[PDB]
């Protein structure tokens, strides 16, 4: 069996299925719910600092106008690095995505002024107290700051607090308010988050106990469907899901009760069985035991299989005919549809041959299948005992009616009312058996065989009960599954020893068990979360990727995002994900919309992107060379400097392009025959005060470099912050003269500060109370098991 292993494993490496069985359950019950991220700070990007200003040719004018500047200005060097940088912001934005907000939780005293004032947040506060005192601020300012009082309306829950942010800041925080993604909450909604089914399942009691303030608030679960059809290619992963979903199931499936003492039955069994009667291959039909277990296993196992939309095989044992009979039970119910074609192969033929056909005297030509139409079915066309004949069509045609769309989008491949609790199928499965008692071969044969058959029949009164049981259970549990479920040929099986099967069968009494209330919920809850995570990450995923494209980040895109994606999903251990899989996964992802939320924000970042980049203190966009004595310009803030707010009149050379693609010296020639040229993108930076410098023409130096090193990182350019002061070098204005800068740069001037326009009002709701888990508010009991009912309404489990 060693040879079988190595290969049976080479396959398991193509399956992101975690190793141990159990190890998987935990991962689920564990998937906690998404943490809310209420929030404190208003959140900005820039506060306004004072700064020295020197009038044209002037000294520190003594005044210090207020300009906007970036808190945390960490910008890389190179257009490309810039684009990547912003991207991180997107990720940060999402991880901080405040689902909701309130202002009282940020209230602050507007220290100054007559009407008890409580402004927005700390920064808002500071600023006021600050300006209040910069004596050169229009009388209107103090006034406004003054009298402007908050806005408190007890009724309706309104709160409009005066605030001050910034155009790009209001921008953010705003939408965060207009997308509080928090819908109300009425007893009725809790009632409704319940499967349209359960409520109507008499056996279960419903009741309300706690009330609900108009303060009630929850967050949509978000249960979009599949979005991703993994059902038609990612086998490796389905197998891993099935498995998972499966274990999950077993964890739920109620344990059975009141069984017939193991010993008692097996003993009357030997009396009936006539075991040791010549036949050589003894004690293979009694390895049946451990039934007090086998049945429990066979039972659970069967359900999950179904629910989880798994497929399996059968630790079959040819000799042990009994074990076969019961097989017939299995097909009588479980829709063969979900049973790898093969295990059904063995089973049937084993029945067909070592049974029916000869003991029934018919085809004494025993039989011979290939691989298309089934031995259980074709046998029909060729059988003359109606009873026998109906079994055949019903068994071959009972296709797990793969067609359902309940309680709002829940394709849960269903099953026959017939089977359900019309049961008869069973009654007919029996009646057909009731006339299989006849000739062909040795005596110890019919004797032994038929006797076993009878044990199915008598018990049949009860076997009925079984049908009802499952009927309900599956039909119940199912209700609470959000994940859809297309029938698929899993790559992996699940062994089901006819041993246990057989036990369950003749071994179940007037027992009656069902899913504990609490149990059910727990189930819903899980799938729920999981879903939420899947859907959510999906959005998180998409959002990035798409951004990744317009943000010309022609690099990571492939794996990078995918890896993180799967990890967060928990369920599987990447690595063993074949490469055609991960990439194919992207191929599908890239073709979807984007949760307005996600999308809506990126659109915002891009519009202000430009503005930020030039807004920084370190780094400007490209430089110009003209080898033409040029007239240095003058700007109030930098004093006497060489800045250019506009390219136009000189070619543009995408540094990014050059660097990334190697150089052809186009630039090398232009520089050499010394021609007017420009360089674009983000770049290092250098300030200098050496009046002298300018005379030395330093700015025309730095450049030569590039060529030797084939690089262009080391391209710090130069600016001359020549203020009529901090420059010891001032033997300049003492001599008639004018600045001869051979070069200048693009860093556009920072923005002046205008109060008015930065002062925005704030629309915030007031006083919530966020609730999670939900359900809990549900009070529910249960009738006593001895009183159940299915669609039937007569009574499930009714053989007193």
């Amino acid at each position: 069996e060693h040879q079988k292993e190595v290969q049976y494993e080479i396959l398991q490496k193509t399956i992101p299925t975690f190793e141990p069985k159990e190890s998987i359950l935990k991962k689920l019950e564990d998937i906690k719910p998404e943490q809310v991220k209420k929030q404190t700070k208003l959140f900005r990007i820039f506060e306004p600092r004072q700064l020295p200003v020197y009038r044209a040719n002037g000294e520190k004018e003594l005044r210090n106008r207020w300009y906007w500047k970036l808190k945390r200005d960490t910008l890389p060097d190179g257009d490309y690095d810039v684009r990547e940088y912003f991207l991180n912001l997107y990720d940060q934005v999402l991880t901080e995505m405040p689902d909701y907000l309130l202002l009282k939780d940020m209230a602050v005293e507007n220290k100054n002024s007559r009407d008890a004032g409580k402004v927005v947040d700390s920064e808002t506060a500071a600023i006021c107290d600050a300006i209040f005192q910069d004596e050169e601020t229009e009388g209107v300012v103090r006034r406004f700051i003054a009298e402007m009082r908050q806005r408190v309306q007890a009724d309706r829950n309104v709160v409009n607090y005066p605030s001050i942010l910034h155009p790009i800041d209001h921008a953010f925080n705003e939408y965060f308010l207009q997308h509080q993604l928090v819908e109300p909450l009425n007893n009725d909604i809790i009632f409704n988050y319940i499967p349209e089914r359960i409520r109507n399942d008499v056996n279960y009691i419903l009741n309300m106990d706690r009330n609900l303030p108009s303060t009630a608030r929850y967050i949509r679960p978000n249960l979009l469907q599949d979005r991703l059809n993994l059902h038609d290619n990612f086998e490796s992963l389905w197998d891993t899901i099935t498995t998972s979903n499966y274990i999950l199931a077993r964890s739920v499936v109620p344990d059975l009760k009141e069984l017939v003492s193991t010993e008692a039955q097996i003993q009357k069994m030997s009396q009936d069985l006539q075991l040791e009667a010549l036949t050589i291959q003894s004690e293979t039909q009694f390895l049946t035991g451990i039934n007090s277990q086998a049945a429990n296993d066979c039972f659970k196992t069967l359900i999950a299989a179904m629910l989880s939309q798994r497929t399996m095989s059968l630790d079959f044992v040819t000799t042990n005919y009994m074990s076969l009979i019961s097989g017939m039970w299995l097909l009588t119910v479980v829709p063969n549809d979900m049973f790898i074609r093969e295990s059904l192969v063995a089973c049937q033929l084993a029945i067909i041959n070592t049974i029916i056909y000869p003991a029934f005297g018919m085809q004494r030509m025993h039989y011979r299948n290939g691989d298309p139409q089934t031995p259980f079915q074709i046998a029909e066309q060729q059988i003359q005992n109606f009873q026998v004949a109906n079994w055949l069509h019903f068994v071959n045609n009972n296709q797990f009616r793969q067609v359902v769309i309940d309680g709002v989008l829940n394709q849960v491949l269903n099953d026959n009312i017939r089977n359900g609790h019309v049961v008869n199928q069973l009654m007919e499965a029996l009646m057909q058996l009731s006339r299989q008692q006849f000739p062909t071969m040795p005596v110890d044969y019919k004797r032994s065989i038929q006797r076993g058959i009878l044990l199915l029949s008598n018990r049949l009164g009860q076997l009925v009960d079984l049908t009802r049981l499952l009927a309900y259970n599956y039909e119940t549990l199912m209700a609470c599954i959000t994940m859809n479920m297309q029938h698929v040929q899993t790559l992996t099986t699940e062994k089901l020893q006819l041993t246990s099967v057989t036990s369950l069968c003749m071994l179940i009494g007037n027992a009656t068990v069902i899913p504990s209330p609490q149990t059910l919920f727990h189930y819903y809850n899980v799938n729920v979360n999981f879903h939420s995570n899947y859907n959510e990450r999906i959005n998180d995923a998409v959002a990035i990727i798409t951004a990744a494209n317009r943000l010309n980040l022609y690099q990571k895109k492939m794996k990078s995002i995918v890896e993180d994606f799967l990890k967060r999903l928990q369920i599987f251990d990447i690595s063993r994900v074949p490469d055609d899989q991960m990439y194919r996964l992207r191929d599908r992802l890239r073709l979807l919309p984007v949760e307005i939320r996600r999308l809506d924000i990126f659109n915002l970042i891009l519009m202000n992107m430009e503005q930020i980049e030039r807004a920084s203190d370190k780094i400007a966009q490209g430089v110009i060379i003209a080898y033409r004595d040029m007239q240095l310009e003058r700007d109030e803030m930098y004093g006497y400097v060489n800045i250019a707010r506009n390219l136009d009149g000189f070619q543009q050379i995408n540094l990014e392009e050059l660097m990334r693609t190697g150089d052809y010296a186009q630039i090398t020639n232009m520089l050499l025959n010394n021609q007017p040229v420009a360089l674009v993108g983000a770049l290092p930076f250098i300030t200098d005060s050496s009046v002298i410098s300018l005379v030395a023409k330093l700015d025309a130096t730095v450049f030569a470099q590039i060529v030797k090193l084939r690089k262009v990182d080391t391209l710090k350019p130069i600016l001359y912050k020549i203020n009529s002061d901090s420059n010891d070098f001032y033997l300049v204005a003492n001599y008639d003269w004018v600045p001869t800068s051979t070069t200048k740069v693009y860093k556009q001037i920072p923005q002046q500060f205008d109060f008015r326009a930065s002062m925005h009002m704030l629309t915030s709701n007031l006083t919530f109370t966020v609730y999670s888990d939900l359900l809990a508010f549900v009070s529910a009991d249960t009738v006593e098991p001895i009183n159940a009912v299915a669609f039937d309404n007569m009574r499930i489990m009714n053989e007193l």
Binding site: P167, H170, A171, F172, E174, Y175, Q178, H179, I596, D600, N603, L604, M607, N646
Partner: protein
């Protein structure tokens, strides 16, 4: 040329879908397109007229954009917008008229005016949109 077209459907679908009240998510796809324009324009100078009794009005660009934010639109939002539209309207009118009079034996199928010739430029193509007229 096609450029030109957009400029309008932009304004129409604008002076039309931007009213006191409407829900933002009806214009999200729109708003964007709009801004995109302002950008491409700002930093450009134009001139129309000069022929017969047609005035020679000059134009410059330098505009702020639009908050994207807000569930619904408040009156104030509109007025600050309408003020910007009216400059473009009064613009296009003058642009159309200026290219609606000149004729050329040679390429009477190509752009004429200093105003439009400049538009067919590549750097402006980033504005095209919804050609269903």
């Amino acid at each position: 040329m096609d450029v030109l077209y957009s400029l309008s459907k932009t304004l129409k679908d604008a002076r039309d879908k931007i009213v006191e009240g409407t829900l933002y998510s009806n214009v999200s796809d729109l708003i964007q397109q709009f801004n995109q324009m302002i950008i491409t324009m700002n930093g450009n100078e134009f001139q129309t007229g000069g022929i017969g009794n047609l005035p020679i009005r000059n134009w410059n660009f330098d505009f702020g954009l639009l908050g994207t934010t807000l569930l619904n639109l408040d009156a104030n939002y509109v007025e600050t917008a309408r003020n910007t539209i009216d400059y473009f309207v009064d613009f296009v009118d003058n642009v159309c008229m200026d290219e609606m009079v000149r004729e050329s034996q040679r390429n009477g199928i190509a752009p004429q005016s200093d105003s439009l010739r400049k538009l067919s430029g590549i750097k402006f193509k980033r504005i095209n949109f919804d050609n269903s007229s």
